């Protein structure tokens, strides 16, 4: 149908504990609609959850495919991200479901809480339909036990643990993505316009971090770079997917035969227009590499981009 | 392990019997094991009675929840185990019940 | 002897306090009046022993205790991994491996 869903009030918001994991963790959760204004969400975030305005905002993008990272890359990336979010008070926006890079940042947070104090306010904005248990959370303002166990044939991925807060976006379908992306971008834009405490007159800076990804990662990076206040983008080469081709295009820029990767589709179709646009706006892009160039720490790479 | 080409519970049971935890941590628990339903809880029950702290911790770390695993029947089976170190529970039970119990008596939670 | 006596006295403070909490109000010379009050009432610990709490206070106390035990274990591990013996042993093992 043409989005013909009645706007019944929300009936799933409160706290959930993750049972079955290797830890005891709590996470506030609120399900909302895709038309919620960013100001209302920020009011709920700063008032009901008691979260101050952050001094740094990190957006993490990746591929929903459950990819794999080489040794000594995931460790360095995880510790750099954790240090960059721990030394300075920062929010880590993630996909939310336990797929791909979100599992990697969940494991990075798992290593951090193993041997360090403090709490990292990691916010996962995930669609409502793809959670394994749409039920088992309908208790309003009450604790609901949750099972971290997952099965391959469920077709609905469980919510990743080690996430301090959640926001669930609903449009009606179940098993289909693309219901929170506009909400996520509008929330980031609204946070960026919020004034930081300093009286100089700058808003909360926003950075984007890309790992692995796929065809949509190029489009998202291009949309980030074309916004009137530009958002710097940091890319890791060793992932293998379109992050690697972005790292290649960062080198020897201003080789079309070298653009035969064929990981997306047949060779006849190409996105060379948007890739050349990205290489045209390549001063904002900063690429991380181990020993090949500077910024051997992910923590130093992200901060110097801002 | 790879020579048997058996199911994951068989390899896990072999590693549990050998009391080699790092082999199970590396070789067994890998990307998409596709555990059969009820296998992990059976392995937890087997690891409890054999006094394997490391394996109980490892199974807890990978999805096994005690709030669903533990029941009255499983606790009763735990209290009647034999594949473990020596204990003085039977003598205390005999003293409380004044030696009226027949041989090979089945302990119950009321006795505990 | 004096350290043991101090410890035993601090232990017996509790027994003394409970003994005088159970005690009736009147002193022994005129305890006769209250010694016959329970006779008629036979055929007829809010604080000082316990402290009854509600559910919300119970949950808050449980979370506080959990935070305390987690902090204690983390502090113990951090103290152990920074002692001189551990550093010496780890350095020796890594030096031997590096030499090989």
Swiss-Prot record, chain B:
Q: What is this protein called?
A: Transient receptor potential cation channel subfamily M member 3
Give a short account of what the protein does. Answer: Constitutively active, non-selective divalent cation-conducting channel that is permeable to Ca(2+), Mn(2+), and Mg(2+), with a high permeability for Ca(2+). However, can be enhanced by increasing temperature and by ligands, including the endogenous neurosteroid pregnenolone sulfate and sphingosine-1 and suppressed by intracellular Mg(2+). Implicated in a variety of cellular processes, including insulin/peptide secretion, vascular constriction and dilation, noxious heat sensing, inflammatory and spontaneous pain sensitivity.
Quaternary structure note: Homotetramer. Interacts with TRPM1; the interaction results in the formation of a heteromultimeric cation channel complex that are functionally different from the homomeric channels.
**Where in the cell?**
Cell membrane
Cystine residue pairs: none
**Gene name per UniProt:** Trpm3
Question: What did gene disruption experiments reveal?
Answer: Trpm3-deficient mice exhibit clear deficits in their avoidance to noxious heat. Trpm3-deficient mice display reduced hypersensitivity to thermal, but not to mechanical, stimuli in carrageen-induced inflammatory pain. In the chronic constriction injury (CCI) model of neuropathic pain, intraperitoneal injection of isosakuranetin or primidone do not reduced heat sensitivity in Trpm3-deficient mice.
Q: Which family does it belong to?
A: Belongs to the transient receptor (TC 1.A.4) family. LTrpC subfamily. TRPM3 sub-subfamily.
